[PDB]
Ligand binder design. Sequence first.
Ligand SMILES: Cc1cc2nc3c(=O)[nH]c(=O)nc-3n(C[C@H](O)[C@H](O)[C@H](O)COP(=O)(O)OP(=O)(O)OC[C@H]3O[C@@H](n4cnc5c(N)ncnc54)[C@H](O)[C@@H]3O)c2cc1C
Ligand SMILES: Cc1cc2nc3c(=O)[nH]c(=O)nc-3n(C[C@H](O)[C@H](O)[C@H](O)COP(=O)(O)OP(=O)(O)OC[C@H]3O[C@@H](n4cnc5c(N)ncnc54)[C@H](O)[C@@H]3O)c2cc1C
Ligand SMILES: [Cl-]
Ligand SMILES: [Cl-]
Lengths: 543, 555
Amino acid sequence: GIIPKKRQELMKWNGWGYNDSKFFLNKKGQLELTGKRYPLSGVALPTFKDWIQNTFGINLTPPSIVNEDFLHELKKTNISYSQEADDRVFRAHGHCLHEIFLLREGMFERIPDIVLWPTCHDDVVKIVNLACKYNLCIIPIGGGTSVSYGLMCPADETRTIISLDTSQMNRILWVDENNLTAHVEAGITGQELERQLKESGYCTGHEPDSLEFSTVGGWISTRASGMKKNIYGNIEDLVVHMKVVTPRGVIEKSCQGPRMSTGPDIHHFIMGSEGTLGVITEATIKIRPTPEYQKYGSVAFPNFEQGVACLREIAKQRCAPASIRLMDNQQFQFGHALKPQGFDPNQLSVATLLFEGDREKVLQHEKQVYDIAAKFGGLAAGEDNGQRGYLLTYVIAYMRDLGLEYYIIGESFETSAPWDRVVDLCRNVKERIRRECKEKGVQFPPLSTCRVTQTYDAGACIFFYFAFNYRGISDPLAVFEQTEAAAREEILANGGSLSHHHGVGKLRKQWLKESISDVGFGMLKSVKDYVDPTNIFGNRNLL
Amino acid sequence: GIIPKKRQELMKWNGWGYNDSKFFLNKKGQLELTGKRYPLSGVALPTFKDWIQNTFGINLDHKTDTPPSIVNEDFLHELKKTNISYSQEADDRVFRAHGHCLHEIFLLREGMFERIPDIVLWPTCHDDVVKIVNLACKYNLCIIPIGGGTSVSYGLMCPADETRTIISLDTSQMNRILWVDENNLTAHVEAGITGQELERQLKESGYCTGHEPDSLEFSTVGGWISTRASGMKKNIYGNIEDLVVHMKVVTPRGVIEKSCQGPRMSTGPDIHHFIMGSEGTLGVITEATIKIRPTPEYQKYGSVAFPNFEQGVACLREIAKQRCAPASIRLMDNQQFQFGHALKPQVSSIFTSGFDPNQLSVATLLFEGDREKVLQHEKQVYDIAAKFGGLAAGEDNGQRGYLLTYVIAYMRDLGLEYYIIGESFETSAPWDRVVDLCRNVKERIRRECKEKGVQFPPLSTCRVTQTYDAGACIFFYFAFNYRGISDPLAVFEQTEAAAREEILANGGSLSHHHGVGKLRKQWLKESISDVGFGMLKSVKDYVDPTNIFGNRNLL
Ligand SMILES: Cc1cc2nc3c(=O)[nH]c(=O)nc-3n(C[C@H](O)[C@H](O)[C@H](O)COP(=O)(O)OP(=O)(O)OC[C@H]3O[C@@H](n4cnc5c(N)ncnc54)[C@H](O)[C@@H]3O)c2cc1C
Ligand SMILES: Cc1cc2nc3c(=O)[nH]c(=O)nc-3n(C[C@H](O)[C@H](O)[C@H](O)COP(=O)(O)OP(=O)(O)OC[C@H]3O[C@@H](n4cnc5c(N)ncnc54)[C@H](O)[C@@H]3O)c2cc1C
Ligand SMILES: [Cl-]
Ligand SMILES: [Cl-]
């Protein structure tokens, strides 16, 4: 649960997650996740092979450049550090498909020169002051799970780049049971956070799909969103307090009030700042008693549009359960192919549901939901089919490394949009992808899929998967990366946002000024130029 | 509900609200509000005089030019070409030279302002605002935007040593609903529309915002966004920062707006939060998209009495812990309970003055939404309450407390005719500090007054007015009879500063909703750290580099 210093002992240098977990074919020729870590671990998936085959038409380093008298002064603090190639390479990237290619195939252009491992707030203060004194460049890293190029080192950064690794700065500092808050160190992962809260009878309920590795500091930095936000809030509702070390000095409010009116909220200057302003070291987060009961469910709809209209109605009545998701037909069948052991089934769409709270309330709420669904032609599809798409939630990123071994490339991307744009966006965006792949010479129709993943009063988060069999293609990355950018253009033309939770990093920089206005961009820059005049925090995300 | 241009035709020039609405003594010597505007209007309040006498020690017998307009003639020339409506009349300028602080109100009654705006403009749309801002760059002018003029933090006071021509940029003619989107449940509005007129207009469509601050008859969308306003039913509808989905802001550097109308994004720090709470320092909010909701099918009032205030707080804490706070829940201390009881129709005899009626606190409750849910919910709340000693005090006591809300501000003016000065002030605090903060702040107040030579013990009262997961908003009221005190405004001002210091030392914030204005400037840096303060200043220096927006709030 604590990320160890040498990450490659536990985690894959060249892909997602733990060394001991990959898809392989078992002794019966069926796909299976190796290892003992998950629910799905060791569970044969008899129809997954057949699904992959039908869907995709397949069968089956630079030296360290670091100052000698900086290094000297660092030796004084006994802060742990490393200049080893694997250590720097492990931290030179996140989890974009571009990045995960290179790794396996070539080498990166720039990697950190030196990794540092602070264990507390004061360590981070010292590091930041050394960086000021000796003109060095810092890139913070927590889980390393960025999907937005947020950790890529600018290839023209000629300063020494410090990788400031927050993974040893990872304690629950205090739990305040009267105020239901917990003060934690920013390097704690979501797993280690919940596991510890759970022993006192509390949780945070913040469940991004990367919680095994993503950290509190990361969440704040990227404006992270979790599967159960309908109950617990997204990151900007969970955080009541934070402490940030910048070159200019330390940021922190003096009181733990729940809500204030003392000028523009400075917390909001830091959430989303994507590593560009300083290091978030500590944060206070709301907690909640561990829910009494959990119930899964699912609903089948005659088509995707009926499903969307139902999710709209559920949001309009303000009775979304802990989680509700609507998959289109493709993503359904994906799902249904992964089972252990009326309607037209080619347009048929499926919502999955998660209820949690008092057992009394769950089954009451559940009934209100299926009654609403029934007005749209919804029909209960059973708890097991619901319980699946959610026990399957944390495997999906192991699947990418399995596609790559068979010449399949895919990646996800997401947006949020007002309710009245959701249907046209899904359609036009899934169709632009298909159009671009054919025009770029992809030989097989891509996987082009969407789901509705979060509901809000004023609209929805939409999630896309895109993948294709690249064989016979000259330059597969370029095609892919051109098709993704075209999908983004389709997204923005259909009134969707630049991003709902992934952030901007360096992947989506080119669209920011248009998204937030020129003066908006100027405002961000003006904070940057004040907090960090000498651009110590030089990952160049956002701006 | 639209503010017409010459406000003093309708509103008091020297205090709260409407001309037609003030307290007076009726033909049988009972206090009574004039006019026909409120539910209490024209209703004799037979025990209100007694309560005032018991509480303040007065009889209720003993009662109690402008700077020239300096404006560049060329500016004026270009201003006429735009056909934007304007005034240099002294009463338009003085009306817009203040908000509703005691201190301001007092000068109004007793003297003249040091500095008042030099010209009042009334833009009717966004492009008018762009024009004005451009004219202020060109002619080196200062702009102070005003909506309702209901600020209570000095937010509208013109700094005395501002030497540039000051435009009072009044937004009240900028008041249309531009579209109501029933698909997305949003409404796009001009920022000068009042709470009253917004809700009246949405209601005709079957919708509401449910944003209900006590100043809603006058306060504006732009105002709310500027001050980070909180309304009475936030538990259901959210505070301003939850309600606003979109905004357009004209600043000297250009116009801020996002390019989409999505519910939630991750595109860097959220610039909407750079403008929320900006108190007129950065530019003009011209238009906003706000969430709306179907008009609630059903409302119910209720009330609960508790053995004491502590028990009341523990119950609110539990209700918040179970996440079942209704539309509105407010807990009043014994003094406020007694106050409310004195606002009732039965006429007492002049020869008369298991719960103790002098420690007992009362929670007022509002539930709204679907009949079925309301009712279920109401049960759940009383079931909880009953474990803290709570007894139902009846639907009429709840209804009264909430009907009373919009008249309390007319009592301040009544107080002032009889030598009583009073002012409210608020904070937010974690749960575990609430009971102590209330006990200590009230006791600081009573000690400062006595030390300052106040004769009769002051009214010092609180209520817990909002619940959150992490804490509560606490609202205080403070008043005393100043009669026979030398410099009464000084004694008052210093006692309020002392109370603020007690608040901060008991783990409370600088403000929950009133904001910082010019009144709390000295505490801000400590509140947000120096670097925090520094970031604010850098956005100010970038968006308004010549300080056109010169009201000098916050920084
Ligand atoms: C398989 C997978 C599933 C995912 N699921 C979700 C999801 O459900 N919801 C969601 O929101 N995201 C999701 N993400 C994206 C990602 O996990 C989040 O953006 C997460 O917040 C990043 O946290 P991290 O600790 O891994 O940060 P990192 O990847 O280490 O860094 C993220 C950015 O923040 C900066 N940073 C990191 N720590 C600090 C610090 N303490 N101080 C200052 N800056 C810092 C870095 O410089 C970088 O720019 C997913 C990603 C993957 C690969
Ligand atoms: C009796 C009474 C009850 C109150 N109750 C509450 C309450 O329940 N909740 C609460 O939060 N507040 C309350 N207040 C405080 C006040 O009404 C709120 O702060 C409200 O938001 C102010 O709105 P307004 O339109 O009157 O703004 P104004 O007083 O006109 O201006 C407020 C500030 O915003 C700036 N400003 C105004 N319009 C714009 C604009 N369009 N663009 C940029 N800047 C602008 C002004 O320069 C000023 O600094 C109350 C006040 C009184 C007197
Ligand atoms: Cl994700
Ligand atoms: Cl108020």
